[PDB]
């Protein structure tokens, strides 16, 4: 039990330490700030990256918006547009929609796990790891490490649900 | 020591005896035998023979079984027979009653080749109609109880009193003598061989250089058995219309 | 060696014996089942006439028809089972098949029919 | 609150459990293997062509009519009219109202009795066997039959002509169970029996491999339309409103995972198992056709992969028994994710009985009517470790069944239930009824008396097994 | 050892066996379960084929190919493909068989009653030969087992051929595996197989010399009605075999493409002005393999294969086998000839080496 | 359990892999193998393979031996090789020195088909002339020491410390895994199988319904091995020019 950002940071540190992935990071499914039984409508949300592995701090200052009409809608939005709790691109070169944060194409595999609240079935975070070459070996991710990332995503979903319950109680 | 006769070796060794199958039927068998063997739950299934018909659609007959057991001094194989007319689709060849067995035994001539045909017999005038598949099953039963040849001491009895392959079988000492072979339904160690059969109903040709013996039935001309002694394989096949040779005393 | 082959034959005989024993048991149980069923199918008229809980004949017209039936026996001999009684009852129309069916149905309820208090 | 039927029959404290919201799940599930072909079974009849005392009208017709809903309602209406008349101004009006109700119930009973004579299938032997199984408190029937590997492979993996209408392998089983469900719900009101269908597409076929995903979706849709036509009959399946009634559950059988990929089929099913909404008000655009999805024999990784793809997995069928414990990781997973497990091993097709004590192994040529499949049973024997091991274990199962005075075929089912599984047991038919549990001669009303032919200690909330029972059963495999 | 009768991980092999066994004989009439009436059988497709069984006889005589039983199943598979009313084939020829690390391919070269649509070549690239012309004159179907489901391969493009000329790959048997990342091949394994087909079909399919007459107004090969069949071992000589299909230029086409240029000795590049051998060039003229260590003479492009150990034997059959594409053979007995490929799809010659990186672009001011 | 590979079954199972022989050569082998086996005093003699040549007279190569013994942790078979160009008359294929082994290893290309030809090599300029039969024998030696595949635990050691067939062999438990097969020269019970070879140099295709596994060498493309598990037979054959595949890293 801790602040949600502490939870995300701990998850990222775990994914980096135990998995042979090159980098791990985490974002929050944010809503656009204001200017100056219905289903969830994710059609107006974005990813705000708030935690990242050791040696990867440029990620903290990165967002991911949907374009407004042609640019490729980034790949990770499949987590939200069709509610896929897990995406795996074993070779980023084969996907157009994947987008790099340093604007320089790289080589490796990518994995995303949409963190969802079990009681409600809504996505709140996104834990990701990859092996883009210069940082970590450009090889794909074994099934063991993919499964470990999945497990960490689920444990984080649990802890996040609990912390949200406590915080909503404290009101 | 083989575990089951191989149709390729059988067709290779018994081709000199005129026991051959069509090329299309050979390929079709190579595919169809495993399918039927699996979907019937059988441990063994082989090509038993081929009976010629008047319309050119010869009956291929296959025989399978699961386990053989010793009952009442006989090695009983719970066999099941299938027939086919193209080599691709096997149908059942159902057993026949004892009363009908006599009637179909009275029917002679080459089979028609139409599984829906039925012959007629007359008795005291009560007429019976016997289906052709009944005649086929009866002829197969007669030929089977007459020959069913295996080498001597190639089988053995196990703890559960079942007849299993003798995997330490060394081979027939004298392959050119009828003592080296026996009927399948004779218990291991019973000392009953083909030499106890009616003298003159079997012929044996042994090529002592290559080591291949051929045992031909003279009572049922068309039943051939082969035994290769350098590779320790053997196997038999029937090819013909299925009628017994009753004039044997005049032909020897 | 001789002892071992004797033992093997003995054990095979034992197995065959167990198969025969189970076959015997099944035959005997089926025989008893058929006997029970025949006994039950015989006593049906005596049940629907005498002991049927919803009375279809109240045992009085029963005896009236029994007397009128035994009456004809004298003209038959000079010139009786419950099933015959029922035949006469149904033929005259004293009992209809649907009444028998509904009464048997009510009886079929186990301790939950309206035969309470 | 215990179930109002199990508690009555076996004195069970067990509460009613649900597979999905709105669908109950009995503790044992009847895997329905047919005794003949559906075309034959659907053509049987009971109406034969001064007091017979042996007709079906006096023996089976009455034992059916007594168990109906309108007849029991009529009986309770009379039993209440008695008390209402023995209690008595306004109560006279109440008595007249009850009299009207009784006249209506009587007319309804007359009609439901005439229905038996109208439908020539209502009193057959297989309808009776299924109904008797239902009244025993097992109202969940799973479509099954003889399948891979000991069936007509040319019918399983064959290629059908173009004019052939779409029909799965288990189409006849679905037609038969649908006729039975319709009749049973006609007699005893809706929601009484629950059918679990089984979809097994020909992954290796020509159209499949040539069509891609837009064919793997049309196949699923056509199968669901066919299944609805089979179960709900021609006209049924649609509520008084335009909203159709959904099928209970669909199980997916996948032949090879490296050949083809399940995910298109699973996503199509999932789309059919959710209500597709739309907003201007949030209203339904597409009603659901399915309530849930099950997976038959997924190897603990394709199950986790289907989870990670976010499909709602209701139940998982598995082969798990006292001697066959291969599907253990699937259990450890379905526990962690809260997914019901239907085990189908149980008694090894019939080999866990007293008939096979000290016996010789069966033989597929001779035949054996006390087994589901002789080849399948011998396959199970090989997977166990032989026939000597099967004998050495059936001895222990018999000892345990004796120590507690119960059938040997209930020790195994209880060992299954103790592992969180819902046992799946094969239906027996036509004078072999109830032998699936070990009850002999139960085909006659005289030996049974109308009782269910299954031991009660199975349905208790606590297991009748001693500690040493568990210690011995945990040493078999 | 104690195993089941058949493992549970065998439904794929069982489906393959059922498909293969369904080739023989007539199909059984199936009925409608709900109705009880027999289902109407499909009307058969009208097509023309060769005698695949006789070709099997020839190749078995020579001692090359698949075997006499595989060729019978292949004949029946050709019969099945030619009879599918859906695919609408009008002519079939069994091409051959490619090995693979996990499965194998059986190939069928055909023409259709109505070709599909070919997307226009994106500009900046060599144009495409339409259906029925040059390389894309035959539509190819492929399967992993005889009688199994047939997947139509896509048309081939010059870029695919030119790119495949740089690869040395073991096939895998899966029509959608990745071929290679560098050199960048543009497609999956299906396109690489189509490319190998297009190269081998032009380098190795032959007919006996003088069997056809080449027209100079077109490329249509009509057969002279006066051609005396050579007899005996003389068909074991490459000088009596003519290339049946057009040569394949280094540009990736059978007819090289020249763009709009006035002295075209320096504008048109070499590969753009390449002219190959004339129609029906004999196998005597094909370029030999490079010399190998141990001998100075370049090995020939073709070799003879004999059906007997004595020249005196009557009714001999003979043919030639390729040395550039080990696996392809042609044979002829009388007026009856055939050609067939069975192999891995690996060109031999020792003239392959790893591709180096593309040259890094230089700066603007040079 | 077989005692020796059968050329008929080998040619039948490995025909799909393109490992075929001419019809005349097939008949000629059926006659010639027993003659040479007897007149050489050998217990085993089989067809090892067939190497293609530039003039169309391919070399058939046969391998025989008498007994195999365990020496220095290796199961050594004292093998003897014969060659032929028609399948009827077998000549000796004599061993080659170690010094010449390197030179013939340097010679590449398809063989000429003329047993009297000799190639030339140049060194520091000393020229060597290497006979063609020397090149043939070394290619055969290389392919043999690379593959020589048998099933695992199909052989066994006897009291005299000799490698003999294990007549109680039950079969490979998992026929689709490389652990089920081994090199011939690996001692029984040594635990060294084909899985200890360089990963990626073997391919295995297993038809689980018929029970036939095919093991192909990718390092020496042309070496095929088959194992039939329902009949417990196996056997291998090489067909090709005899050159090793050195580009394997780029082809996988």
D364 with B38: Cβ contact below 8 A: no
Q: F175: closest CA among F121, F229, F139?
A: F229
CA diameter of chain C: 86
E21 with B35: Cβ contact below 8 A: yes
When CB atoms are compared, the residue of C29, C37, C97 closest to D440 is C29
When CB atoms are compared, the residue of F12, F167, F210 closest to B167 is F167
Instruction: Using CA coordinates, name the residue in chain B closest to C8.
Output: B159
Residue B77 belongs to what H/E stretch? strand B74-77
Residue recorded with tokens 């067995």? B101
Q: F39: closest CA among F80, F85, F5?
A: F80
D365 with B160: Cβ contact below 8 A: no
Phi, then psi, of F98 in degrees rounded to 5: -75, -40
Q: Please tell me the distance from the alpha carbon of residue A85 to that of residue D307, in angstroms, as a whole number.
A: 9
CA A6 to chain centre: 15
Question: Quick check: helix, strand or coil at residue D91?
Answer: helix
Determine which of E9, E12, E103 to mutate to test the interface with D (most D C-beta atoms within 10 Å). Answer: E12
User: Residue B168: its chain F contacts at CB < 8 A?
Assistant: 167
When CB atoms are compared, the residue of E21, E23, E68 closest to B23 is E68
Q: Please tell me the distance from the alpha carbon of residue A25 to that of residue A18, in angstroms, as a whole number.
A: 14
Task: Give me D290's structure tokens.
Answer: 């399915």
Q: Please tell me the distance from the alpha carbon of residue E322 to that of residue A39, in angstroms, as a whole number.
A: 67
Q: Confirm or reject contact between B66 and chain E (CB < 8 A).
A: no
C12 with B161: Cβ contact below 8 A: yes
Residue E207 belongs to what H/E stretch? strand E206-208
Contacts of D274 (CB under 8 A, 6+ apart): D288
Residues of B with a Cβ under 8 Å from any F Cβ are: 1-4, 6, 8-9, 12, 34, 38, 167-168, 209-210, 230-233
Q: Confirm or reject contact between A66 and chain D (CB < 8 A).
A: no
Q: Please tell me the distance from the alpha carbon of residue D42 to that of residue F171, in angstroms, as a whole number.
A: 48
Q: E291: closest CA among B70, D268, D339, F109?
A: F109
Give the minimum alpha-carbon distance from C8 to chain B in angstroms, rounded to a whole number: 6
Q: Does the CA dihedral D371-D372-D378-D380 come out positive or negative? A: negative
Q: Confirm or reject contact between E102 and chain D (CB < 8 A).
A: no
Q: Are C84 and C69 in contact (CB under 8 A)?
A: yes
Write the DSSP symbol of residue E287: P
B41 with D153: Cβ contact below 8 A: no
User: Residue B34: its chain E contacts at CB < 8 A?
Assistant: 17
| Residue count of chain C | 117
Q: F206: closest CA among E9, B35, E147?
A: E9
Give the minimum alpha-carbon distance from D168 to chain E in angstroms, rounded to a whole number: 11
Residue recorded with tokens 């001597």? B152
C9 with B160: Cβ contact below 8 A: no
Q: Cis (ω within 30 of 0) for the bond into E183?
A: yes
Q: Confirm or reject contact between F126 and chain E (CB < 8 A).
A: no
Q: Are D197 and D174 in contact (CB under 8 A)?
A: yes
Q: Please tell me the distance from the alpha carbon of residue F180 to that of residue F198, in angstroms, as a whole number.
A: 16
Half-sphere exposure of A40 (CA within 13 A, CB side): 15
Q: Does the CA dihedral A89-A92-A96-A98 come out positive or negative? A: positive
Residues in A 124-143 with any Cβ partner in D closer than 8 A? none
Q: Are D298 and D316 in contact (CB under 8 A)?
A: yes
User: Residue F139: its chain E contacts at CB < 8 A?
Assistant: none
When CB atoms are compared, the residue of D65, D78, D359 closest to C114 is D78
Beta bridge partners of B109: none
Q: Please tell me the distance from the alpha carbon of residue E331 to that of residue E62, in angstroms, as a whole number.
A: 8
Q: Confirm or reject contact between E17 and chain B (CB < 8 A).
A: yes
B86 with E24: Cβ contact below 8 A: yes
Q: F85: closest CA among F25, F18, F157?
A: F25
Phi, then psi, of A160 in degrees rounded to 5: -70, -45
Q: Do chains D and A meet with 3 or more Cβ pairs nearer than 8 Å? A: yes
- The helices-and-strands tally (H runs, E runs) of chain D is 18, 12
Q: Confirm or reject contact between E355 and chain F (CB < 8 A).
A: no
Q: Are D199 and D222 in contact (CB under 8 A)?
A: no
Give the minimum alpha-carbon distance from C16 to chain B in angstroms, rounded to a whole number: 10
Resolution (angstroms) equals 3.0
Question: Quick check: helix, strand or coil at residue D194?
Answer: strand
CA E271 to chain centre: 25
Determine which of F4, F5, F6 to mutate to test the interface with B (most B C-beta atoms within 10 Å). Answer: F6
Instruction: Using CA coordinates, name the residue in chain A closest to D263.
Output: A84
User: Residue E22: its chain B contacts at CB < 8 A?
Assistant: 88
Determine which of E309, E346, E351, E355 to mutate to test the interface with F (most F C-beta atoms within 10 Å). Answer: E309
Q: Are D406 and D400 in contact (CB under 8 A)?
A: no
F24 with E3: Cβ contact below 8 A: no
Q: How many CB atoms are closer than 10 A to CB C63?
A: 11
Residues in D 59-98 with any Cβ partner in C closer than 8 A? 61-63, 65-66, 71-72, 75, 78-79, 82
Question: Quick check: helix, strand or coil at residue E74?
Answer: helix
Contacts of D413 (CB under 8 A, 6+ apart): D28, D346, D347, D423, D425, D437, D458
Per DSSP, helices labelled H in chain A are 4-18, 78-81, 143-169
Q: Do chains C and A meet with 3 or more Cβ pairs nearer than 8 Å? A: no
Strands E206-208 and E241-243: antiparallel
Determine which of D34, D39, D42 to mutate to test the interface with E (most E C-beta atoms within 10 Å). Answer: D39
B231 with F1: Cβ contact below 8 A: no
Task: Give me E347's structure tokens.
Answer: 């060109």
Q: Are F206 and F238 in contact (CB under 8 A)?
A: no
Q: Are D121 and D183 in contact (CB under 8 A)?
A: yes
Residue F131 belongs to what H/E stretch? strand F126-131
Q: Please tell me the distance from the alpha carbon of residue B56 to that of residue B110, in angstroms, as a whole number.
A: 11
Residue recorded with tokens 């200052």? A61
Which class for E336: exposed (0-12), middle (13-18), buried (19 or more C-beta within 10 A)?
Answer: middle
Contacts of D293 (CB under 8 A, 6+ apart): D249, D250, D251, D252, D266, D269, D270, D273, D311, D312, D313, D314
Structure determined by: cryo-EM
Q: Are C108 and D66 in contact (CB under 8 A)?
A: yes
When CB atoms are compared, the residue of B35, B38, B41 closest to D374 is B41
User: Which chains are adjacent to chain F, needing at least 3 Cβ pairs under 8 Å?
Assistant: B, E
E149 with D148: Cβ contact below 8 A: no
Beta bridge partners of F205: F214
B38 with E14: Cβ contact below 8 A: yes
What crossing angle do the helices spanning B23-39 and E68-83 adopt, rounded to 10°?
Answer: 80
Q: Please tell me the distance from the alpha carbon of residue C74 to that of residue D412, in angstroms, as a whole number.
A: 68
User: Residue E16: its chain B contacts at CB < 8 A?
Assistant: none
Phi, then psi, of F12 in degrees rounded to 5: -75, -45
Q: Are F215 and F235 in contact (CB under 8 A)?
A: no
When CB atoms are compared, the residue of B38, B78, B160 closest to D363 is B78
Q: Please tell me the distance from the alpha carbon of residue A29 to that of residue A125, in angstroms, as a whole number.
A: 5
């Amino acid at each position: 039990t801790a602040e949600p950002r502490e939870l995300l940071e701990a998850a990222v540190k775990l994914v980096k330490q135990h998995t042979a992935a090159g980098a791990a990071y985490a974002a929050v499914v944010a809503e656009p700030e204001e200017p100056d039984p219905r289903p969830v409508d994710y059609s107006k949300k974005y990813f705000a990256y708030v935690a990242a592995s050791a040696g990867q701090e440029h990620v903290l200052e990165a967002d991911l918006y949907r374009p407004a009409p042609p640019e490729p809608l980034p790949y990770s939005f499949r987590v939200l547009d069709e509610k896929l709790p897990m995406l795996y691109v074993p070779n980023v070169a084969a996907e157009e929609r994947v987008k790099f944060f340093r604007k320089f194409p790289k080589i490796g595999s990518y994995q995303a796990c949409g963190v969802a609240l079990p009681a409600s079935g809504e996505f709140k975070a996104l834990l990701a790891a990859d092996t883009l070459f210069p940082e970590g070996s450009g090889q794909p991710l074994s099934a063991d490490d993919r499964d470990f990332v999945w497990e960490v995503s689920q444990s984080l979903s649990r802890a996040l649900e609990a912390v949200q319950a406590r915080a909503a109680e404290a009101l | 020591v083989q575990l089951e006769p191989n149709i390729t070796l059988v067709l290779k060794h018994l081709a000199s005896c005129g026991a051959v199958v069509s090329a299309e039927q050979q390929a079709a068998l190579d595919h169809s035998i495993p399918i039927k063997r699996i979907e019937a739950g059988l441990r063994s299934l082989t090509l038993w023979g081929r009976l010629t018909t008047l319309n050119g659609k010869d009956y291929l007959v296959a025989e399978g079984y699961n386990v053989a057991s010793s009952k009442e001094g006989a090695a009983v194989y719970e066999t099941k027979y299938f027939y086919s007319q193209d080599g691709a689709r096997w149908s059942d060849l159902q057993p026949v009653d004892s009363e009908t067995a006599t009637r179909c035994a009275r029917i002679k001539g080459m089979l028609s080749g139409d599984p829906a045909k039925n012959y007629e017999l007359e008795e005291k005038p009560l007429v019976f109609q016997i289906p052709e598949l009944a005649v086929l099953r009866c002829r197969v039963d007669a030929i089977a109880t007459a020959t069913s040849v295996i080498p001597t001491d190639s089988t053995i009895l196990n703890a559960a009193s079942q007849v299993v392959p003798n995997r330490l079988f060394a081979g027939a000492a004298y392959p050119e003598k009828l003592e080296s072979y026996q009927h399948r339904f004779s218990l291991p160690g019973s000392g009953v061989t083909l030499s106890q059969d009616l003298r003159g109903t079997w012929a044996v040709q042994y090529d002592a250089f290559k080591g291949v013996a051929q045992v031909r039935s003279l009572l049922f001309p068309g039943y051939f058995f082969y035994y290769a002694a350098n590779e320790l394989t053997w196997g038999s096949l029937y090819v013909g219309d299925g009628l017994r040779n009753n004039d044997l005393i005049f032909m020897l | 060696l001789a002892a071992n082959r004797s033992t093997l034959a003995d054990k095979a005989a034992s197995t065959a014996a167990t198969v025969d024993a189970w076959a015997e048991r099944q035959a005997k149980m089926e025989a008893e089942l058929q006997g029970k069923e025949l006994e039950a199918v015989r006593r049906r008229p005596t049940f629907v006439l005498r002991e049927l809980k919803p009375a279809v004949a109240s045992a009085d017209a029963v005896e009236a028809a029994a007397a009128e039936l035994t009456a004809q026996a004298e003209e038959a001999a000079n010139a009786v089972t419950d099933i015959d009684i029922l035949s006469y009852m149904m033929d005259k129309g004293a009992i209809t098949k649907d009444a028998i069916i509904q009464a048997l149905a009510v009886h079929a309820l186990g301790d939950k029919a309206y035969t309470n208090h | 609150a215990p179930d109002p039927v199990l508690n009555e029959l076996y004195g069970s404290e067990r509460p009613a459990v649900e597979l999905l919201p709105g669908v109950p799940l009995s503790p044992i599930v009847n895997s329905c293997w047919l005794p003949a072909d559906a075309k034959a079974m659907l053509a049987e009849s009971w109406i034969p062509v001064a007091f017979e005392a042996a007709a079906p009208e006096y023996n089976e017709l009455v034992r059916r009519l007594a168990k109906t809903a309108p007849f029991r309602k009529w009986n309770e209406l009379t039993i209440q009219a008695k008390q209402l008349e023995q209690e008595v101004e306004a109560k006279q009006a109440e008595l007249e109202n009850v009299k009207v109700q009784i006249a209506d119930a009587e007319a309804a009973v007359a009609e439901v009795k005439q229905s038996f004579s109208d439908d020539p299938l209502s009193l057959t032997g297989w309808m009776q066997a299924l109904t008797d199984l239902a009244d025993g408190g097992m109202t969940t029937f799973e479509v099954s039959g003889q399948g891979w590997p000991y069936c007509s492979l040319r019918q399983l993996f064959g290629e059908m002509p173009s004019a052939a209408p779409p029909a799965g392998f288990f189409d006849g089983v679905e037609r038969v169970l649908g006729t039975f469900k319709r009749r049973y719900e006609k007699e005893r009101g809706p929601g009484s029996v629950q059918l679990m269908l089984k979809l097994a597409p020909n992954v290796f076929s020509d159209a499949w491999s040539t069509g891609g995903a837009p064919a793997a979706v049309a196949a699923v849709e056509a199968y669901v339309e066919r299944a609805r036509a089979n179960v709900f009959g021609p006209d049924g399946g649609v509520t008084p409103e335009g909203v159709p009634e959904p099928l209970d559950l669909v199980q997916l059988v996948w032949w090879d995972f490296a050949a083809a990929d399940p995910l298109p089929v699973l996503k199509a099913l999932q789309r059919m198992a959710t209500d597709q909404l739309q907003v201007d008000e949030v209203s339904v655009s597409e009603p659901k056709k399915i309530r849930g999805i099950g997976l038959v024999d997924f190897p603990a990784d394709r199950l986790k992969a289907a989870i990670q793809a976010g499909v709602p997995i209701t139940c998982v069928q598995v082969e798990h028994s006292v001697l066959v414990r291969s599907a253990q990781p699937v259990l450890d997973l379905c526990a962690k994710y809260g997914i019901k497990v239907l085990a189908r091993g149980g008694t090894l097709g019939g080999l866990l009985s007293a008939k096979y004590l000290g016996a010789p192994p069966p033989d597929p040529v001779r035949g054996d009517a006390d087994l589901d499949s002789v080849p399948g049973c011998l396959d199970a024997v090989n997977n166990v470790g032989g026939w000597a091991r099967l004998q050495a274990a059936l001895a222990v199962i018999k000892g345990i069944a004796d120590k507690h005075g119960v059938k040997p075929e209930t020790v195994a089912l209880r060992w299954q239930i103790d592992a969180g599984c819902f046992p799946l047991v094969t239906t027996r038919w036509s004078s072999r009824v109830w032998r699936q549990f070990g009850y002999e001669g139960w085909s006659s009303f005289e030996v049974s008396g109308g009782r269910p032919g299954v031991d009660g200690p199975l349905f208790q909330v606590e297991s009748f097994l001693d500690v040493e029972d568990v210690r011995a059963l945990a040493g078999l495999a | 050892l104690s195993v089941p009768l058949v493992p549970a991980a065998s439904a794929a092999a069982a489906a393959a066996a059922v498909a293969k066994a369904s080739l023989f004989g007539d199909p059984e009439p199936v009925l409608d379960p709900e109705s009880g009436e027999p289902i109407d059988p499909d009307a058969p497709n009208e097509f023309e084929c060769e005698d695949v069984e006789g070709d099997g006889d020839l190749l078995d005589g020579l001692g090359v190919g698949l075997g006499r039983q595989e060729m019978y199943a292949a004949m029946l598979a050709v019969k099945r493909l030619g009879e599918d009313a859906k695919r609408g084939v009008s002519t079939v020829r069994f091409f051959g068989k490619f090995f693979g690390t996990q499965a194998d391919y059986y190939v069928f070269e055909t023409t259709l009653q109505s070709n599909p649509d070919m997307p226009e070549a994106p500009e900046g690239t060599i144009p495409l030969e339409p259906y029925g012309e040059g390389v894309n004159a035959y539509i190819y179907f492929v399967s992993n087992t005889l009688g199994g489901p047939l997947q139509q391969l896509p048309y081939v493009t010059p870029e695919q051929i030119k790119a495949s000329r740089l690869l040395r790959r073991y096939l895998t048997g899966r029509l959608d595996a990745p071929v290679s990342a560098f050199p960048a091949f543009p497609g999956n394994e299906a396109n690489y197989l189509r490319a190998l087909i297009a190269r081998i079909s032009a380098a190795t399919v032959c007919c006996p010399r003088g069997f056809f007459t080449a027209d100079d107004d077109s490329a249509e090969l009509s057969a002279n009605d006066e051609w005396v069949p050579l007899k005996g071992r003389e068909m074991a000589l490459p000088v009596n075999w003519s290339h049946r299909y057009a040569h394949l230029k280094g540009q990736g086409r059978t007819v090289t493409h020249k763009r709009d240029p006035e002295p075209e000795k320096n504008f048109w590049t070499a590969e753009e002005m390449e002219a190959g051998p004339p129609p029906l060039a004999t196998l005597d003229t094909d370029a030999p393999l490079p010399a190998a260590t141990g001998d100075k003479v370049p090995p020939p492009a073709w070799s003879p294969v004999f059906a007997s150990a004595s020249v005196t034997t009557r009714n001999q059959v003979a043919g030639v086998r390729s040395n550039r594409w080990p696996g392809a053979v042609c044979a002829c007995a009388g007026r009856h000839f055939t050609s067939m490929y069975v192999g891995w799809g690996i060109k031999a010659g020792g003239e392959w080496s790893p591709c180096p990186p593309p040259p890094p672009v230089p700066q603007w001011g040079a």
